[PDB]
Each structure stands twice: as C-alpha cells, then as structure tokens.
Amino acid sequence: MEKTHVQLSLPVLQVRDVLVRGFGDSVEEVLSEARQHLKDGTCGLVEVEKGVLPQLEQPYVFIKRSDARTAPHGHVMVELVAELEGIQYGRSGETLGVLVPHVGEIPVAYRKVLLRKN
Ligand SMILES: CNCc1csc(-c2cccc(Cl)c2)n1
C-alpha cells in the first residue's frame, strides 16, 4: 500500500562530518538499509565532488535522477542505485549524491526529492 513515490527533504551533510559512512556490507543490504533510513527520516545526502567517495564506505548508495519532466513541487524525481567495485546495480540518470545514515550531524542544506521507493 506504499505510494510509488514519496516527497522527502534530505539533510545534506559534508563528508568530513559523517559519522556512519555507509549502510552495510553488500549491495542488497545497503539498498535495504537506505530504504529503511529514508522511511524513518534518518538518511542524509553527501554531494559528490573530488575526494568524497574514497572517504565513504562501499557499497555506495546513490540517488539518481529518474526523469526529466515534472519535478513536482520542487522535488526532483529520483531512484536508488548501488555501486560496488565499479559495478552498478540499477541504471538511471545523473547522481544527486550519495546516501548515508544521518545520526544528528548538522547539515549545510536540504535537498527536496520525490523518491521512487522501489
Ligand atoms: C519520512 N519519510 C516519509 C516516508 C513515509 S513512507 C516512506 C518510505 C516507505 C518505504 C520505502 C521508502 Cl524508501 C520510504 N517514507
């Protein structure tokens, strides 16, 4: 009974502030955990720049843009894609950032997305 998409406002974290630097130890686990933390409001976003991914833990969970129209209410439509050892699980659009657990770090901005749950 989950609606297919949910509007979320994600805290954007600087990489050196992140305390828990990934969601788990396999592709399937990190996708599962990321979805749980999104549902619970305990998921942050790190914008990818040079130096960022080597300071985070693989497998990575990205949010990627899933369509070019719409963006209803200022929320870019996105979906989850995981990466391990240079192989991606999912194909989608441009990366908005890498998801990490949020455990109370102070963000620098909030990023509004319309997330495809599955
Ligand atoms: C505070 N977030 C709002 C919310 C409500 S239901 C929900 C959700 C349910 C299943 C999978 C995912 Cl990825 C998200 N998120």
Side-chain angles (χ1 to χ4, degrees), residues 1-38 40-49 51-72 74-118:
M1 278 297 303
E2 292 289 349
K3 279 178 212 182
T4 67
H5 287 80
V6 56
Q7 281 184 6
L8 299 172
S9 278
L10 299 180
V12 178
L13 306 182
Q14 275 275 3
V15 72
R16 292 179 181 286
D17 284 338
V18 172
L19 297 184
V20 183
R21 284 177 181 251
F23 282 112
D25 299 341
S26 69
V27 164
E28 284 170 346
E29 184 181 19
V30 300
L31 288 164
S32 177
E33 286 297 339
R35 287 177 167 114
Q36 190 62 238
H37 282 264
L38 285 157
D40 299 349
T42 57
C43 189
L45 180 72
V46 182
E47 293 181 305
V48 180
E49 299 295 345
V52 165
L53 292 175
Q55 295 184 87
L56 296 174
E57 291 173 354
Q58 290 190 77
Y60 311 121
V61 178
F62 300 110
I63 48 159
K64 286 181 165 295
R65 185 166 72 152
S66 54
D67 147 57
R69 291 179 159 224
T70 73
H75 290 79
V76 173
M77 206 166 332
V78 302
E79 66 187 299
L80 301 189
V81 170
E83 176 186 309
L84 175 62
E85 292 185 341
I87 298 173
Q88 294 198 342
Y89 297 78
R91 74 188 301 264
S92 186
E94 164 199 9
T95 297
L96 279 81
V98 53
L99 300 182
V100 294
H102 182 230
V103 298
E105 302 94 329
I106 301 306
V108 296
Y110 285 85
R111 194 75 162 97
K112 288 182 280 233
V113 302
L114 184 56
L115 167 75
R116 182 205 300 181
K117 291 174 186 165
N118 184 26

